[PDB]
Amino acid sequence: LASINTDFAFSLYKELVLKNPDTNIVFSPLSISAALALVSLGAKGNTLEEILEGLKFNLTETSEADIHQGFGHLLQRLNQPKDQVQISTGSALFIEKRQQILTEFQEKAKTLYQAEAFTADFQQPRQAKKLINDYVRKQTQGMIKELVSDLDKRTLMVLVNYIYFKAKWKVPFDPLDTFKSEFYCGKRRPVIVPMMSMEDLTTPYFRDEELSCTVVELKYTGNASALFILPDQGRMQQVEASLQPETLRKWKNSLKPRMIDELHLPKFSISTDYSLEDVLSKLGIREVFSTQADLSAITGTKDLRVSQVVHKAVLDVAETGTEAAAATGVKFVPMSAKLYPLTVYFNRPFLIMIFDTETEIAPFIAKIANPK
After folding, report:
1. How many Å is the Cα radius of gyration of the chain?
2. Co-location of 120 and 160 in the same domain
């Protein structure tokens, strides 16, 4: 399941980069997969089959029922605060007023995914826009306030999906060590950003000479970790091309505790909005969006199809973990005698993957092209 989801993650990543070159990317392969699996609960025939296979499942080896129990158990576990890690996630369907939603589907949606399907009047855009955003504002207790822009009048169905998280570093950054540093973003003008830094960090490290990148794992205090991949100068495109579950397995097998004499990591809060129909079509999920959609297990008719899939991911990196630390005064920084210090400075584009350590599923995958 971890491997299936990771394969989906990297497939999606590549399609997203192709769409948006040289830009920050942040998404959840976990939450996106869960939202699409929620739709597959109401699908049948080739509509159903294409969703599950686009998610990288092999249906000769895996049951549709196991797929829903799989994401089901995981999501029931994750939004629950445990050891100071909270991965907050949710999905919802909004269906045009003309159509009825079957109680059977709604019961399964709540049971398996803690999700609901609501009626919306899309013929009145501002009203439907407000209904969706109000729901997500309530659900996230203010964390996401305006998930959706101007929706088309002809919308039959929008699938809505979000993720954000809170966690604390095993080794926090001292906010007094945060300083303004240049990030080499390849822009016309220099880009100066808040740079966190620490010294004498013992953390898992791997220098990958084949792929010309450095891999540093930073642990959170709970069952979670952040993997930071820094391609060598010039080597981002090649590292992006090499992303496959096998490469990730290699990195994870090859990590060893190392003493990093100085670490520089940008402090940032990046949120993204994706309308995912195009990239999902490129992954072979197509019928669900088409006139040939079978969503008869949602409506009891063949009139429904997914019009939009909206995904918002928020990733924060700061001194305490996801949360910024308050700073007072001025710190004296003495130069070390240290002769051949190991330094790792994330001041050019890098990639991040956040892992649930119990399963190795990645709630977040990101490329930080510019953290400003």
Report:
1. 22
2. yes
